[PDB]
Design a protein around this ligand. Sequence first.
Ligand SMILES: *[C@@H]1O[C@H](CO)[C@@H](O[C@@H]2O[C@H](CO)[C@@H](O[C@@H]3O[C@H](CO)[C@@H](O[C@H]4O[C@H](CO)[C@@H](O)[C@H](O)[C@@H]4O)[C@H](O)[C@@H]3O)[C@H](O)[C@H]2NC(C)=O)[C@H](O)[C@H]1NC(C)=O
Ligand SMILES: *[C@@H]1O[C@H](CO)[C@@H](O[C@@H]2O[C@H](CO)[C@@H](O[C@@H]3O[C@H](CO)[C@@H](O[C@H]4O[C@H](CO)[C@@H](O)[C@H](O)[C@@H]4O)[C@H](O)[C@@H]3O)[C@H](O)[C@H]2NC(C)=O)[C@H](O)[C@H]1NC(C)=O
Ligand SMILES: *[C@@H]1O[C@H](CO)[C@@H](O[C@@H]2O[C@H](CO)[C@@H](O[C@@H]3O[C@H](CO)[C@@H](O[C@H]4O[C@H](CO)[C@@H](O)[C@H](O)[C@@H]4O)[C@H](O)[C@@H]3O)[C@H](O)[C@H]2NC(C)=O)[C@H](O)[C@H]1NC(C)=O
Ligand SMILES: *[C@@H]1O[C@H](CO)[C@@H](O[C@@H]2O[C@H](CO)[C@@H](O[C@@H]3O[C@H](CO)[C@@H](O[C@H]4O[C@H](CO)[C@@H](O)[C@H](O)[C@@H]4O)[C@H](O)[C@@H]3O)[C@H](O)[C@H]2NC(C)=O)[C@H](O)[C@H]1NC(C)=O
Ligand SMILES: *[C@@H]1O[C@H](CO)[C@@H](O[C@@H]2O[C@H](CO)[C@@H](O[C@@H]3O[C@H](CO)[C@@H](O[C@H]4O[C@H](CO)[C@@H](O)[C@H](O)[C@@H]4O)[C@H](O)[C@@H]3O)[C@H](O)[C@H]2NC(C)=O)[C@H](O)[C@H]1NC(C)=O
Ligand SMILES: *[C@@H]1O[C@H](CO)[C@@H](O)[C@H](O)[C@H]1NC(C)=O
Ligand SMILES: *[C@@H]1O[C@H](CO)[C@@H](O)[C@H](O)[C@H]1NC(C)=O
Ligand SMILES: *[C@@H]1O[C@H](CO)[C@@H](O)[C@H](O)[C@H]1NC(C)=O
Ligand SMILES: *[C@@H]1O[C@H](CO)[C@@H](O)[C@H](O)[C@H]1NC(C)=O
Ligand SMILES: *[C@@H]1O[C@H](CO)[C@@H](O)[C@H](O)[C@H]1NC(C)=O
Lengths: 316, 316, 316, 316, 316
Amino acid sequence: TAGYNKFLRPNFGGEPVQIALTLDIASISSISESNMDYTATIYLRQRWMDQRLVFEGNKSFTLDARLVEFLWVPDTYIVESKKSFLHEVTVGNRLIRLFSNGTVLYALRITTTVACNMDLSKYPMDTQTCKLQLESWGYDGNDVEFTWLRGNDSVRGLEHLRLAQYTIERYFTLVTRSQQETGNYTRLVLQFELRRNVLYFILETYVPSTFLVVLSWVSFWISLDSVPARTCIGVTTVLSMTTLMIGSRTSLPNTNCFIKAIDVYLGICFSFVFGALLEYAVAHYSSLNVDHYSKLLFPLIFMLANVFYWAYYMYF
Amino acid sequence: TAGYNKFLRPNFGGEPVQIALTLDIASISSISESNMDYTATIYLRQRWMDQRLVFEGNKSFTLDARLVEFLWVPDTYIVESKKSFLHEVTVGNRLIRLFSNGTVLYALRITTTVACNMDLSKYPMDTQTCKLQLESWGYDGNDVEFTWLRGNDSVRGLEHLRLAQYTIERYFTLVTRSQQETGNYTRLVLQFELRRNVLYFILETYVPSTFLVVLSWVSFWISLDSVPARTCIGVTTVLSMTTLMIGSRTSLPNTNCFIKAIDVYLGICFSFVFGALLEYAVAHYSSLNVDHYSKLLFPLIFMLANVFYWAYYMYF
Amino acid sequence: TAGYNKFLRPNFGGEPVQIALTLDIASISSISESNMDYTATIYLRQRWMDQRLVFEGNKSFTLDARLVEFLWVPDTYIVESKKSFLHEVTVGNRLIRLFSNGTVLYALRITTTVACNMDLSKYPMDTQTCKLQLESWGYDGNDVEFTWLRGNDSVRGLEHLRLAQYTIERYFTLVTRSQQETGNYTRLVLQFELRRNVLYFILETYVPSTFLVVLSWVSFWISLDSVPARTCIGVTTVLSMTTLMIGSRTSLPNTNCFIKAIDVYLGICFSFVFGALLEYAVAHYSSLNVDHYSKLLFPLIFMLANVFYWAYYMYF
Amino acid sequence: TAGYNKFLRPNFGGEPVQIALTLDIASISSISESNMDYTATIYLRQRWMDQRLVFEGNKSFTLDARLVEFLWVPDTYIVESKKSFLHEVTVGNRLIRLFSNGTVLYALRITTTVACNMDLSKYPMDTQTCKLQLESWGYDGNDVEFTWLRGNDSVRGLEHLRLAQYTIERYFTLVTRSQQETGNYTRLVLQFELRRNVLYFILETYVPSTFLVVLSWVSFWISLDSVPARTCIGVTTVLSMTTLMIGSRTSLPNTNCFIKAIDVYLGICFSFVFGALLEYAVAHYSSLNVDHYSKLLFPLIFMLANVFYWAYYMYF
Amino acid sequence: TAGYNKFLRPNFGGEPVQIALTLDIASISSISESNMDYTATIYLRQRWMDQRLVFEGNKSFTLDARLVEFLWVPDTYIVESKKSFLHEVTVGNRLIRLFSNGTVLYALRITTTVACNMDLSKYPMDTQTCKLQLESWGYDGNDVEFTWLRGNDSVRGLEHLRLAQYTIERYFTLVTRSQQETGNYTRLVLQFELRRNVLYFILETYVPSTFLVVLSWVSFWISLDSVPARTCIGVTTVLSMTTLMIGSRTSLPNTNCFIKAIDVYLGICFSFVFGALLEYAVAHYSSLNVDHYSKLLFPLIFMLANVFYWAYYMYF
Ligand SMILES: *[C@@H]1O[C@H](CO)[C@@H](O[C@@H]2O[C@H](CO)[C@@H](O[C@@H]3O[C@H](CO)[C@@H](O[C@H]4O[C@H](CO)[C@@H](O)[C@H](O)[C@@H]4O)[C@H](O)[C@@H]3O)[C@H](O)[C@H]2NC(C)=O)[C@H](O)[C@H]1NC(C)=O
Ligand SMILES: *[C@@H]1O[C@H](CO)[C@@H](O[C@@H]2O[C@H](CO)[C@@H](O[C@@H]3O[C@H](CO)[C@@H](O[C@H]4O[C@H](CO)[C@@H](O)[C@H](O)[C@@H]4O)[C@H](O)[C@@H]3O)[C@H](O)[C@H]2NC(C)=O)[C@H](O)[C@H]1NC(C)=O
Ligand SMILES: *[C@@H]1O[C@H](CO)[C@@H](O[C@@H]2O[C@H](CO)[C@@H](O[C@@H]3O[C@H](CO)[C@@H](O[C@H]4O[C@H](CO)[C@@H](O)[C@H](O)[C@@H]4O)[C@H](O)[C@@H]3O)[C@H](O)[C@H]2NC(C)=O)[C@H](O)[C@H]1NC(C)=O
Ligand SMILES: *[C@@H]1O[C@H](CO)[C@@H](O[C@@H]2O[C@H](CO)[C@@H](O[C@@H]3O[C@H](CO)[C@@H](O[C@H]4O[C@H](CO)[C@@H](O)[C@H](O)[C@@H]4O)[C@H](O)[C@@H]3O)[C@H](O)[C@H]2NC(C)=O)[C@H](O)[C@H]1NC(C)=O
Ligand SMILES: *[C@@H]1O[C@H](CO)[C@@H](O[C@@H]2O[C@H](CO)[C@@H](O[C@@H]3O[C@H](CO)[C@@H](O[C@H]4O[C@H](CO)[C@@H](O)[C@H](O)[C@@H]4O)[C@H](O)[C@@H]3O)[C@H](O)[C@H]2NC(C)=O)[C@H](O)[C@H]1NC(C)=O
Ligand SMILES: *[C@@H]1O[C@H](CO)[C@@H](O)[C@H](O)[C@H]1NC(C)=O
Ligand SMILES: *[C@@H]1O[C@H](CO)[C@@H](O)[C@H](O)[C@H]1NC(C)=O
Ligand SMILES: *[C@@H]1O[C@H](CO)[C@@H](O)[C@H](O)[C@H]1NC(C)=O
Ligand SMILES: *[C@@H]1O[C@H](CO)[C@@H](O)[C@H](O)[C@H]1NC(C)=O
Ligand SMILES: *[C@@H]1O[C@H](CO)[C@@H](O)[C@H](O)[C@H]1NC(C)=O
């Protein structure tokens, strides 16, 4: 038999509730470039002070998940979560650990699929900046005031995340004053950058294509007298380049149409190989020295093209 | 101990309930051409006036999700939703914010998979018109009357949606009088067009095929005396075209059989390349000038074909 | 405080319950040839007469989903449903609209994955007959008697279904007397045929292969003197045919092994192309007129083969 | 107000409960070679005798799913189920039909994903023996004694199962005495064999490869004088074989690494084709009759290889 | 009517609860290299002593899943579980079997998707060490003390696990003292290694590539006089190698970018084949004995490369 002495939010009217958040990223996975999202498991720890549960004697009361519904808990929500759930492995992953002075420790295990934009302009050399924002979904700023428990180091576990492709290169936590239709709210934003592994992509596509085109333009040293050999090398290189392009197109079936960087490099290599074939034909027609078109023509143009490519994907 | 004074719909008998809807599209994703649907997360805000909850003093009562079931809430439903759920991240995403004069603000976070037809006649240059209709699923028009809170600008967040392929080019909200078996209903329709990104598809397929066929028909300037060179160019171009067609067929495994536009263009390019091969054979047979069949034959026919293609996909 | 006056099925003992069913197919999608099923969203309207809820005054009582559990509702089930759920978008999609004389209108929004056999003997020219059967799962025929409200026109919405591949060509509703172990039951069967779109498949595979083989057998008009040209055409056609076959094998990765029709046609085309190559070799050996083997040999055999193919896929 | 007279298991102490099981396989689908499982929908009928619900008068009481929780029901579980659920289409699929003498008929509609090993040593000619075991998960043998209602014919519906690939060739039901840590249990095992459709796989891979190699070794009758023709046939056959192998590798992307049978046959065909090429080179070198290496060399070795292959996949 | 005599954890204050865990892995499946996880079904048996449920007479009380919530059960959780659920096949898979002296046997059937890192540096010859850690999620070490019932042999069923690719080669159970923010905890870790099946991968890629390159470098014994034969062999081998590389790239579409071992070996084979082509051209240019570059050049370099490869993937 309880009335208004157990249901109202702490300090209902007056000073807002100071809720201190602590985060512990257990894992990050299912980062899809098609849906532009990421799945992460986090340990959401919330600490606030309530004046109505002061009990004598210094000790802790680790409550179960069944008694969580009997007390007041914050209404934190992930701002851009597309699908999420609280873990129920054997019991409910909801603990409340009350303390003598009224400190409440509310810990949850939540798997969230947050939505972050994948600006895949430079597909293999991109650092996607994805955030995990937490906000009091119902209560405005004047009612609930979110805060980070220990500044930047409140979020833990991100330094141990080594993923299939990405590596965390930076992370920082900030508190904002997000304004929307309902009113003023405090949003706790955790911002981390997912730098891709360029080394695998370099050896997968850039190194083979570079070696192929190098073999193509060093074949000009072979004299025009050996026509069938030159035709064989040209045909084999062109066919290998086409097969590589087709396989690369089929290798990653991601729904992320943003005219990527591998497309540009592959188009450059295809341009150089079929231009080498066309210039073989044109050189035969004009002869009616082939290495004069290699000593200072082809490797130099490809070097300039690579310089422009790397300048594009290096600076702004 | 409550009877009929708390369960009945507001103004039960007489003037219908004027419910004002406000929408906030958080994200749009999972747009599949196979299933012809789209997944969107929205903030459904409903505002109506109830005369039985007038409390003295100007203030707001931000209720939790547990007290939502104790009051009357509308029965809004998405007309063509295939699968949807209300978000439960930490607590229920259902708030009721009562006001002094009886205004009720009912906000929900719902992820919906609505079904919209994908008329993929022009696959890379289509603007799919997909709607998100909201209706009082049980109560007819004479009982519940839906309305947009602020006309066209009631829906927010659609201008910030940049997706993997599509870009929103238009959006407008209207109220209808949908007639069905149960009776008369008010349907709130939000109509938005998803224009595709043609630039990526142009460079992916149209530019390479155009360059290949251009190289094919400019090789007629090469004299018939260099037979092996011509056979090499023709064979390489035909093989490259076939590999490109096969890769394109395997590149997008979408279950959207509508004889698309890329199929038509690829068939045109394949027709031109194998016709070039056949005309090489026929030209040899008839010679028993090859550039006479290029100066005003092949590029001109391809130009006419491209003109017809673009006229088809430009106007009606 | 209610006993047996509110829990028992209407007319418990005596005349069975006459429940009239009305169906409204909202959408049909996710038709997979591998799992041999289809996902459909339907509006299940059930109308029966109950004598214990007669209230004075002509009017309707549109009840919510919370009061559905307080009254008796039928136990209709989809006979071959593999996975299904009732929609919960904002509230429960369960309405009961009582009337003065005891008529009860029970409407639900259900998404069902029913299992129907995909006899893919003729893969592109098949009309799969898939049913959506509804039955009183627990109560036998002597207890609950299902009926269609308005005969064939009880089911609505099927005429507006235009899908990715299939088009509805027929639909009809019937009532059966299905016999099983538990007893006698009334099953309401809705039978619809999903005719495939042959036009897309014709232009995708049949037209290119036909053009390729036509080019192959019209090359016999080219004299045997131009040996390298003939070898080039033969090699290019054979390679194109092999690539088309491989791409088609990889194009549709459906788990529906039924030796389909496209396989037969593709095998016929492959047989003709490699037979053309073999007959080139044999013709050279025997010459030691090639068009004598084309004027009345090859196109005529292919015409007979196509006649047999179309006769197989036309009649029985 | 009920105590121990309604909650205890029937015959608590003394003779164990004789529960007779009847099974009705509605469908079998989603048989994945990667996860090594199968999804099946079954009608689990359980019949036992309870002495505490004897009511006068011969009649049946078809109870709803809401009253199932008020009575005692067995704790049957599928032994190797990975994920399963009870169907809730419109109401709960749980009926209890009590009878005069205490017979209880408990019928459920359950979709189960049971795990069965896929020994894919002979991928296209395998008969996987997968079981569907049912056991009293909590109560041991001395408490609950499972039994089949009518021996082998208790399981019904398996004879009407025609699947995408497999065909049921045998089925039998047995009762065991499975021993585990908790104690002695009675396990009801339904064992069925899923024989694959070899006819589709024969025509898909074996027939084309056999025809290709036959064409390869009958080309030895062509004299060595026609060198370019022989090189053309050899190159075309080798390229076709390589493309077929690559497509087959990409055709089935199943995660079932068990060095299958199609791999062995394809390796044999690849060995024969590149050996034919190598022997062309070696025959030219040694000539410095080619059909002497065909009359009694190549088709005979391939015949011996096929004999060994079929002996391996025929007997032990 | 119960107060604090039935809700508190056993021995609340003083000696911690000694909970003995027993594990029974029913199945392991869905091991994905992309998400770096594994799905396993386990039988979690927990044994502890409670002093408040001592009943006279030696016997067992096998309680149902409905009475589990009425007693105290541990809060065990899987540390790195991404998604998990307790099985509900017919009833709840939660049994409590009390005994005379207070022993409680709590058995559950849980399907867990635990996250373990897939260090795919050596893709076909890796032994991934994945753990299944169980911990008292809420209560610290001073409150709940986890223990293995019978040391290493507490975990059962792992010896019968034969999977699609991996084979368990080792398994061991240990108890730790994991330290985190909340306090001191006892973590029960089961560590097992999943050794891959190298035999399938050897015959799939290593054997064909080795045979191809062997045929390539034994063709040097063929004299330079037979130029067209050498060009044919070289072109066929290069095309076969390129097709094999492309198919392998498309064969496994796993999102596990870690520059794997098959990539290195395939790059080595591609290097050798196109180097053989380049050296054919260079040998022709320099001749202006080819087997002098085979007797002690090519097979020896490939042997050294394979020695280095196997030394890398053998030792450290
Ligand atoms: C009963 O009490 C209610 C609460 O006190 C009253 O509701 C208020 O009604 C007034 C006008 O009638 C609202 O003022 C408007 O509010 C709009 C929405 O905030 C404003 O729009 C601006 O802000 C939005 C959100 O930022 C922008 O999207 C938009 O583009 C524009 O910039 C208007 O400019 C205007 O201020 C007020 O907000 C309402 N408050 C609430 C809490 O709903 C109601 O009128 C009372 N009724 C009676 C009969 O007295
Ligand atoms: C008990 O009270 C009930 C409610 O008052 C009575 O139900 C009504 O019964 C009459 C006929 O007995 C129904 O009239 C018909 O309704 C059909 C469905 O609306 C109409 O069909 C037309 O409309 C539908 C829907 O738009 C179209 O799909 C269809 O093609 C056609 O155009 C008929 O034309 C006809 O009007 C009436 O609708 C019923 N009302 C309800 C609410 O169910 C019932 O008869 C009473 N019983 C007794 C014994 O008195
Ligand atoms: C207590 O009361 C119960 C209900 O009144 C009694 O159950 C009945 O028991 C008799 C025999 O003891 C059953 O008769 C048999 O039923 C079989 C199943 O229906 C029949 O099999 C035939 O039909 C099935 C289903 O169509 C076919 O699959 C099968 O191949 C075959 O063709 C038998 O042929 C035979 O009739 C009767 O069905 C039971 N009824 C019910 C409702 O269970 C029970 O015996 C009573 N016990 C005592 C001790 O009196
Ligand atoms: C309180 O009462 C409890 C129940 O009466 C007592 O539990 C029993 O404790 C004894 C030993 O203390 C257990 O005996 C052992 O049980 C092991 C597990 O069954 C056996 O292992 C063998 O069997 C397992 C399972 O088949 C194999 O996996 C294993 O390899 C080996 O072959 C041992 O060999 C030995 O018998 C007994 O099982 C317990 N019974 C139960 C129901 O738990 C408890 O001791 C009592 N405590 C006190 C203080 O009196
Ligand atoms: C009310 O009672 C509460 C409980 O008794 C009090 O909370 C304690 O507050 C003190 C300081 O005010 C905390 O001490 C700090 O705790 C930090 C977190 O443990 C420590 O950080 C170190 O440990 C963490 C975790 O291992 C590391 O991540 C971190 O990098 C660093 O190494 C600090 O160093 C410091 O000890 C104490 O932990 C709090 N205890 C609990 C249970 O919350 C509260 O202050 C009381 N309030 C009043 C007004 O009296
Ligand atoms: C640490 O927090 C401060 C705010 O106190 C912020 O300015 C700073 O940027 C944070 N550190 C990093 C690395 O972002
Ligand atoms: C804005 O709303 C009006 C109705 O008041 C409608 O006519 C108009 O079309 C809307 N605007 C747009 C851009 O559609
Ligand atoms: C319409 O219903 C009748 C039964 O009254 C049935 O015989 C007929 O076949 C149905 N119409 C069609 C097109 O099937
Ligand atoms: C039928 O059941 C008997 C047991 O009574 C068993 O021996 C027999 O093998 C079963 N039939 C088949 C075909 O297995
Ligand atoms: C068995 O347990 C002991 C601890 O008592 C541990 O040291 C040992 O390593 C375990 N066995 C194996 C094979 O790991």
